[model samples]
Target: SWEVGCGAPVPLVTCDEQSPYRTITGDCNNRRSPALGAANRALARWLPAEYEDGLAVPFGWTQRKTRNGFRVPLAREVSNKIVGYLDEEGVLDQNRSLLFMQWGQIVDHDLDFAPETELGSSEHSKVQCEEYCVQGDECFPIMFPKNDPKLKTQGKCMPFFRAGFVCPTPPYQSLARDQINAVTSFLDASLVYGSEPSLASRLRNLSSPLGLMAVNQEAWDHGLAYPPFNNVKPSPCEFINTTAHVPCFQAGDSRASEQILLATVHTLLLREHNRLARELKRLNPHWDGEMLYQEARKILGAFIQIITFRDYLPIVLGSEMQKWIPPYQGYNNSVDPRISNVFTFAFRFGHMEVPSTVSRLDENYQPWGPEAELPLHTLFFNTWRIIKDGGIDPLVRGLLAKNSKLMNQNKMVTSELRNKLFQPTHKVHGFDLAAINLQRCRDHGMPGYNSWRGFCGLSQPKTLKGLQAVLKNKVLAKKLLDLYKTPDNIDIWIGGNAEPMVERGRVGPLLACLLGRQFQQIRDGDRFWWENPGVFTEKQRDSLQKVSFSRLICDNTHITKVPLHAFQANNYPHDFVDCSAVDKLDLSPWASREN
Candidate 1:
């Protein structure tokens, strides 16, 4: 008869260290715990025939063959071996439990609560509630009482609890106070609001349809409904040598992405304004400021709507739109379409009062460079032109036009601004012009651009080859080649013809010829001419002699020099190295491979 909890050596029972149910405790802490020893004994007892007969048992034995017979260790010895094998397992388990307990204690202590007598009585509890609320959790109903007298009558005390009834801790409270003060100051000064006086007044006085419609109309008129670049408004600031100020050019995720994001925001803001305007117009025939502000606040309260629909959707969608309409993506990806659109639209609606705030007619209107100034000037000129066209509202157009004219004249009056405008803001935001020419030279040699027609006083060759190709006369080639072959003759030859080439910017061609002559001399086992004359100008000779064969092939500083070798080796395809004279080369390839 098998009982539910019965086993041969011991009964099956759930055990703890203090549990009395555990039986058959061995050398309790020898290799295995007392409870585990009992369980192992019970397992052996339950499978009697398999264990006693010593018939191949899986858990308790290992097989060995000898000359005379087979061998099997005792089940208890096998269990002991298993326990010894996992010796560190127990220590690890204990440490893990200790860690968990320690962490739990810390958390419990940090968020401890003292019991309260009256509802919302403890100031500490109130502070905790406020902290929770600031984290954007719902703490109101649970912490404080609501305004239901019926619930009080029914002995419920209050209908709702108030969470975060007071402000945050000192640091957060200070931040909040500062933000409030700034907002109040802005409201008081009316700089932002006064730009769109009609809309600002409506926000101040009215509530619904009229206020919302005005905002929407302003958004549309200003071209804030889409990316700004497409709306024909120039950037408020100039984009220049981004390398010195910003990071170097990135291929995919660069300034271009930021511009796209801004464009999206511009589009989304307009869309939301229009959508809310339509809704308000439908709800009320003639609403005032009070109605509009309340409704506007309600719409603004749904932050996810603004973020997901207005910001994200427009950027993602606008990027796709760029493929269809090119202007949506601005030049060099500097200008964000949305920013431009919103700014332009604001300008058109007379909502962006340039004259009062950022007037170009002032003494400080300069930007970074000639290129940068051109665009800003173009922006003001275009804006004024648009205003002058005057198809839209008369009063708004006239004011914007006047402001634009003032901004245009600002650069002319301020010397400081003029100088600042021409200074480089960012490094050239394109491919290296020199490197591009070098690549062209490497592909096609001296035939690419010829400086000299022909004739340098020696036997003339019909076909151009090696030294003959560079120098038209055989005598000059022989003299250069002989000087290169003799080490003592280098200073003499370089002193005469080589120094002049360095001064005239003919170093590239001279170096090319010198390298060809050296290679020819090297192949013929001739030592290069090395004559150190202290009499000649060291600077000019040093420049001529210092130029490398690699530089002649790839460093196309001079427009006239031809690349020496057309083969792969002379093409100078080594990993980029820092030269003392030149700027750092783009090392993106190294980064990619290492990563």
Candidate 2:
């Protein structure tokens, strides 16, 4: 029999006394506390866990009454009535492009991934969770609302695999269980470069001396550059028009081929990494393959950090930006970079930003053809679009051309996401992302809505009237109270989404605080934070600051024009400029002086 503990190691862990490069495992980032921000560690909590049994059982697992003395509403019921956009049409943001939403997804993959636990006991083999309605230690299926509009006819529940958990020491076993975060907390571009040594080695072209990431040879020959082939048999991607030979695009993150749009971004970063590696090698011909690869990785990581903080965050944070993120003073070792449990739940606000359709466009930014756009669900795990279709350039142009779905109080998430998320092209019924989000919060033992408010130092409403004032909608407040029975018992995602948006920000006040705080910590606490003095020379940092997201797009793909700001949406002909005008990062500063 095997036991679990954070301290016990399967393989011995060691660290370099000092090195310019980051370890793939995220060890030794904090020398004093080796496991602080490492992969497979327990996520930190802002407030204590709220397990129903005060140990491991999820809240509402027994369908029992809450602290307010009323059974909480079914997760799917809350999702259908309040979270989903039923017959109502979705609205697009006039100010921001779909890249805004796409970038958030990219950033999220870099920060955290809570891997799901296995289905059955070792003796019993694997359980078919989708075939049954019964709950088990690993399966916490979401029950359908009475006559759920689409799913009630299909089945009683949607299968949900519970997140994997880290073992608590014997003394702390009395406390609630904590879930595992499968990646490092730092925004180190783990999505592009990978989180573990083995994956990192596999991703790189070690056979070559140029330090370039492995690119698909056939795709390159076809003038369609993409991330290397996944090579997994019984292909991971859903191929509609193409064969399994049109394999999934492999990347540092396994979810790279989860959708076409996200896969485009991953493809873009792959080009960027190779572009950097090629240039760095040219600048220092004497440097070894190891030096060139590490240098390029370091540079690419800084570019991600710069683009995220300088361009991406300002729009998300807006006026509250200064209050939460502020200017980077310097790296502070005392600030723990570990991601918070509440932040993970709160950041799901991006789910509302997903658009109903994904578009593909031509060089002139016009629709590629009659089959240019597809429903969001059809694009799931669909690699045909990247290889057999127009490849990455069309999708990149579409992201720049399309607007992100606006955050509406009345209609929060698009029905495409609510009803058909991850649905196969042939299937009508699929898992509900919104319902899964709510249940995941409970599975992680997250405290209710008001507690997050208390955590953020915002006023917690105890009454319906107070909640109405906070939400700024009389009927919505009433609906929430009717479902929850009390303002404090409301689900955090629901409560946070209902609040009025902060000035120029996508999220409301509560989400803004949570997101802003998490990003600030992710930046300030990172030891290799690009702006940190020791990480780069003053001249190198200056050059890195000039590297824009627009420039990255220009350098990588055949797209000739792009918006001045990638995240900001504007009329195409008016604001779209020649990629020639974009400010490119000068690499002369990185020219090695070594003899």
Candidate 3:
């Protein structure tokens, strides 16, 4: 059933003697003689004559009619039709064999499905139904109207269907029930008839002797059918066909499996990498900026190197394992378990310390005129983008180069005073003063150890021979020696009790004194840079003033004038009319009261 509509047909060959009217190429002519009609007549002895003749009839009988209004039939046509029918039957048989084999395998594999389970009364059956039925199998029925008179007429029975064919139930079931019963009976009979070994022997004996011999003879005939026709001088097609033999099975030659496994691993890795990259980029648009930039860059660089270096492990393992696994020749999208495990491992390791909090700001600091929270992830992502696209490498390189040049200048001074500085120590130890001086230069300010060591005290050399070496040339020894000697010129330390002297003034005055002048000059050059108030050229002074301003404006509001109300009036015209006689009737009551 599974292989139905899937098998390729084998071409049938006709011999000259068996054919009624044969040509040199084994083709039979219908117009010259009634070869097809004669062949059909012969076949009609085994089948319905009318049905066979009807199928054998050809088209355009009128144009090629005989004196009695008939057309000659060809032997080839009849033979081909018979062969086609046989091929169809053979295919059907093969499909049925495959289906039954698969069914037996499934039933045998799941031997725990007892009669009670199959009847749907057991918990095991329910579990099986839930697990497998929802995925693909059918084990349930559609509910029908209970009050319907049809149910009473059918003795309250429900109809069952499979593959769109109604399956007879209970009192009158389909052939499937009979088939199932037959199989059950056979199995029970076998159990009573013999022991396991005896049953196995019986099964072995059940094979058809004549059928096996015929199959062997046919196989041999087919194999020799297209063999090298040396006597006849075979055609090119026949010669090529001679080499078409069924391949012998091998224990360990599964190249197809290896390619499949490799492809699976490659696809999974690519998917995982892309997913993580997308998630990271989405979470932190500016991931390459500031501290976040450094973190992401370091992680990505390390990951790239690790993946590149270790990529061969999977390939080698997959290739080795393929020799034992089945050859998977078709497309498969099932992701490898190892790939999932590796992805989870990498995610856990790489994303261990990623920040998950959002940013918060006070009401006064809110740019949207209301207190609000900003997502830190979004901020980080934006910052990262800025760093990535803002030429960070050049900036870092320039900084290092500038520091190196400063160190080189400092080392020149140290070289000039080396003799005087070393005289006391050299004379006391009775050592070669020049050698000691050179050693000191190499030890204290070698470029390999410290790029900035040349700025301290060492002889300046054009090459990195003595002290004036680039940052890349700094050695560990020079770095350690340079760390011991504190440079008088370089002062990176900022915070201590010994604070720089400050002019006594108000916050504004101090800021103006420290930064306002420079800020004004910068603003004069480029006004856009300082459009926002409180920013200053002097870093410390500007920071202090900004903090003070922030504190002053904390939760405070300023008043502004706005219209509270509006007034409007409508104009009216004046007119008058009098009725004196009706108005006099009221005067009598007023007169009586007055009297």
Candidate 4:
């Protein structure tokens, strides 16, 4: 009965006992349980879900009321009142760069993507969720307030497609509406190299003897060399002007062109993969294309892991929480590496860090004087900027040079995000990210704010006064109580986002617990984790440890000057170092020698 997972049946897997390389689908990662962290599987649940109907209906669906006998506040209303911008000034994190936030977005993409349901039950054609505000199994459009100022031009409700779900399992058949993670949960850079075989094949350059990934030949001719064009003709990517025709860039992940900065990061990694593949081929003359390709893929994945754990985590989690994240003690098969639903919800903390404006800088790390800085909303689905706007170098410089937006208790999300996220190109009416975050949490059947706090071993505040103590702000606490009435009725996103930050950390104590624990589980659970003993030789591990995201920037892009800590925001010219001075990974350890 539980054999089907989100319309697809559970795959029958037989482990290849002796293989060192991970299968494209992440099968055989744990021989005992092949589907543990495999792509297209259901996310694990650390705690039982809190659906309103106790099965499928989301909290606040229709006229549903909360524990406090008050109707749950509208997602948009909560967003507008609390998390949304209210003419408050934005604050920049003095210690962190935009790369810190951007990289987290990339890593999140790499880890999990909860694909939405396209069809309804039993031979039914696709449900057109966007056309109506009707509440159905798959379609759960969010309704707006009567006098929503920003959404007046748009329809009464914003379209929302519910996350696809797998059928119920044996013991938990009653609690079986789990959302599916369509990508691998392991931090294996699956986004750079596709998680499934079909996508991976499309990404590789099988036509050539060398093991390089395919690139846009037209762009290469122009010395741009970005990712290959999407197969769909008249690409889905939005253009700068109606006349400016440019194809959307394809990558292992379908969302590569979701934002211009994401596209730039994808381009950088794609270049690094090809560069590594070429070097690997040169060192081992007798190796086949397959060997070279796989080896390079493995190495590149390791490079990503190192950068994320070593550089990204310290800055986001900060010193205190970072201390709690223990060292990798090799792979533990018992640890389920599958991403948890709550953790996915919690990781949206990065949205608070996104700045309103995206920077474009020149070779000298100064602002690109020729072009105006692109607003965050304008950058969405805009791939033409990469091809026509001086390629990826400018964007790369901006990520390194610019500082990330700091989380302010009064205004957690920028107005651009709250009002204009992914709005149609230059047009005004768009979706609110803050509202979407709250809605998605409820849709996923996630427990309330206090429940998660209790899960994390923190005090579960019942009253506004206790919440004020936890948040350390009287005004914000009152605002929250005005919406939810009780702390138990508060949506996790609002409560989590509004919390006071830990000492030197971007996240608060609850988030620190959730993020820190999730990372530890994923790392320890992964069989192909870079630091795991059998995955690589001692020499190779030593070489890989030296690899950094900054070194990758130097090797991949034309921008030469980079700070020693690329994720950290530092003074220009003084803190920056030459490309030569950045320590390089020695590929000599991987060289094959004749016996």
Candidate 5:
């Protein structure tokens, strides 16, 4: 690995001088230090054996063959039916808090998307504007299932288009086969520290010492953003030049403004960046703009990690599952933080939890009016509706008070995201997210459902009885047989979704295994993981852990009342309370005040 970049051989162990050892990542610049993904930079964990040669493995875990056996190409129709079964909708499990779903999304966004081995196709589509704002060939389109298709899936099985690396298992493969590029941390160090130092720098508002990623506040004020393809008239923030104005949208995550609630969270991150920059300036009067911005970014990243692991996770992975994959014991470079394929679909479990209507709540925690319930369809591409209408407060208010959809292992996604998804720009309706999920897996040649059970260290199957426990409804066992002759041939997500929920928890065992390790590695793998030795002073680390969603809400938004633990949708020392009662994060730990 060192020969390519540095033209030197790396020692198996440490020499500090001649060899100095090296990180699993061959890149000399990034994820090479304690402040990166893991201490001393090790290869990402659970990188499948086929990937060990640095290419996509063709078969199931441990059974990597070029042809097919445990992992085989799925027939288009059977895949469609299996996905349909996996997509069945569930009755709402009201015990869940809305923030639980919201935070799950944030975490999912941060660690997920490493699947983009194909970046050129997805990213380039942003510029190649055309009819209905379609992606320019970002897809290797799947065949339309045997005529009896549901959801009016028009052409080529609703295209499972995403940017990911092609890590072909065969020999003579390219060096950077699976193209995981620089975003080891995904988008900016929203959580993990040992991410791309270069990628992070490029997005910075370097002209100012404010230590914030640049945001078009004026444009955001007007909700001036680009809507996807439909024929919606050009937005006011639309670009100039020729006769027709081309709209250019801006946000931290590209999908940030796509949905109202997600956009609300995006708005908070932007504000936090600016807020930290201002506070840092006040704290260190002598600091310049660049220093302030970096220090502020550093602190903000710390806050994100602290809250995510310390507060958010327990709620998503109930106490039962949490025990198996415990939080950071201390940074360990041995475990690779690179995301595994199983997690790619298991995280979709979150899609079920998001509510359909974004209910705008009042200061009293009640729906503001009958109109407060904004259907997701209406808001789909009408992004600027946030600026033109109720502004951020109403949406954020709803985000906290609203209840999320609960899972029954068989529930399908609601019309909110499934059918009416991207409605404003989509022109035509009928987008089956479930169908897309299955198609994508087969496209990638993922290991079968039974393979995943074995991968998670669970029993493959004794009989349909084993499947019955996870699938619950025995009808699915028969359905599984209909789709494929072997239970081992089931898609990972298809089976992962139906796996029995962890003893008495929300996540299925495989999801728990994947999520538990995924997050735990993010914590353990990074040297700069929140509570580390040099990352922050002991005082600062303690205060950072003390920070709560309520304090952050009060500090960032206009709302005065929020639950102390906003992640808990239900009563939190009483549903909603004045922000004053919330514990304040003492940033003085970060301040250089001797006075």
Candidate 6:
């Protein structure tokens, strides 16, 4: 029999000769030696050693309903039109800020994946062009809508779409499947928990008694302590000739620099690593470097839990999901937090909030002017400029002051993320985020939109007129019908994106249920979750809850003051507060009195 996990709740599993990372009750490395890190541990708690389909699930669809008819072309066209717009409204969200978007992507990295390609790179073979699909490849070329006369190519829009690994067909199903199983745990904060064997060894310096990453002290001296990414492509430009040295930080994937927002979040995490190491060393002078490093890793993971549950979730996911979550009474060996295929597709709703520009702001709340703001491309590849122009405080302050666009169906995504995502300043244009998003789900066999809605317990819309019953947009209903030729053929991304806004309840209903269930598993399944009694001293738990994103920013960076809540745009009655006003956690509770 395949191991699904032990079904009954049990006592917490403690680290011994067998523990992963040897972190008390955390078993992330139960299956491996030298666990990647705390972040990886977070993921490990949720996944099984091997992936299996057709586990018990919601909506009662079972395995038979999940199918994505090999239609990458249609997936491309629909994703493009959904968010593709003529001009940038960049309409700001009254409720949220870019900080949330930034964190959302960072946390998304925690559970997301980049499947290994035949070439051993994340890039699809078709990415080079259509000719690359061969014996060792699963690549498919993207095809554009044939009806559009203005198209440049005959049938194919652009090559480089690749399908995910095929899965075993279910007993009743005639369909062949491909996709499901994130090698990383859905429970572990694997983004911070590196999957690499050499992550800690290459980044650490053994000479220090206190745990400290081997940072670029020169850059740190310049007040620019941003972590480095290996120069995958060398630059003639002196500033980016950074490939000479391996970086102090390591992530699971290289797409870390896909945008300025994610890059900045990555920067914040690396800096936090050093800060915790430094402070922990100061508190426990006798502790060895390895001890300090691992202790700091534990604290950093707890901090992420606090921020995600307290600050990020309420603002982005809201109350619609909270009620569905059950209390984590205790540990259950059987709870698997593996990221579900449906949950993975639904969570992408954050794309609705992406704005036209990574905005900056002056003392006033108005547009901070494009001349001062870096273009999407400039920020895409180059992150060194943050401190050169000014230290991170200003950009982060703008991240606080600026608002994200609202999430909804009415083409809220500005051109910046849509038409010109990575358009380099030198080249006039770039590829499409919308196209890639839809193609990605299709590549993974994420079943059609209508099927998912039914899976979500939504009324299954059979006809275009029936789709309008849920969509509420007449124009969009007819548009989807014309494009897909039928309502059932609609792709999940297009269908999920079409759902109406979740306004106060945060994300749309589809996202509400999926995210609700996903995070619930994360808490319930994780043996060492922060709220677990033994994970922290009772006093430490209170202080951990007291911590906020602004406090973390202030602690790690040069920023002195910030808003009471960093996720909400800083404006009006509740403006920025003194750095002193923000409370910090007392790691003293974690201090061993055994001394």
Per-residue lDDT tens digits of candidate 4, residues 1-595? Answer: 4444344544546678788788778777887887788988788888888887777678888675565577888899988788876553547888889998899999999888887655534533233444456776566777787688855677777767677777632213444478888888888889988887787989999998788888888665236468988857445574444566776788888788878889889998898888988898788888888888889989988888889888888777877554667777778899988899988888999999888888788877777866648778777778777787777888888888888988888768998788777633123337888888898988888888888899988999988789889999999999999988889888887788788888777898888888888888889888899989889999999989899888988888877898898888877889899999999989999999989
* lDDT for residue 289 in candidate 1, whole number 0-100: 46
Q: List residue ranges in candidate 4 displaced over 4 A.
A: 1-13, 65-68, 86-90, 120-132, 168-175, 221-224, 233-235, 238-241, 423-429
lDDT of each: 0.22, 0.81, 0.19, 0.81, 0.55, 0.57
Q: Name model 3 segments beyond 4 Å from true.
A: 1-338, 355-376, 380-389, 392-595
**Superior by lDDT: candidate 1 or candidate 3:** 1
Candidate 5 lDDT over residue span 381-485, tens digit each:
345556556667777777677667776545545655655555222344555565556656654446567776777788786467767766677877766766555
Off by over 4 Å in 2: 1-12, 87-90, 119-128, 168-174, 221-224, 239-245, 423-429
Assess the local accuracy of residue 315 in candidate 3 as a C-alpha lDDT between 0 and 100. Answer: 21
TM-scores for every candidate against the unseen true structure: 0.17, 0.95, 0.11, 0.94, 0.77, 0.80
Worst 10 residues of 3 by lDDT: 561-570
Tens-place lDDT per residue, model 1, 1-595, is 2322322222233334442111122112111232222211221111122111222112111234311132322212211221112111112111011112121121111111111112443345444433342211122211112442223433221111111111221122111110000011000111112212232343232343344423222223334332122121222222332122221111101111122111222223333434444455455546554454434333322222222222222221233322222321112212111111011111111100012111111111122123321222222112221222221122211111122211111111111111111211112121111111121111111111111112112222223244444444454445444423321112211211221122212122333232222222211221101111321134423433333322321222111222221111111113222233332222121111211
lDDT of 6 at 489: 63
Q: Per-residue lDDT of 121-146 in model 6, one digit per residue for the tens?
A: 46544344543323223334445565
Judged by whole-model lDDT over C-alpha atoms, candidate 5 comes out at 0.55
Instruction: Locate the minimum summed-lDDT window of 10 residues in model 2.
Output: 1-10
Best of the candidates, TM-score: 2
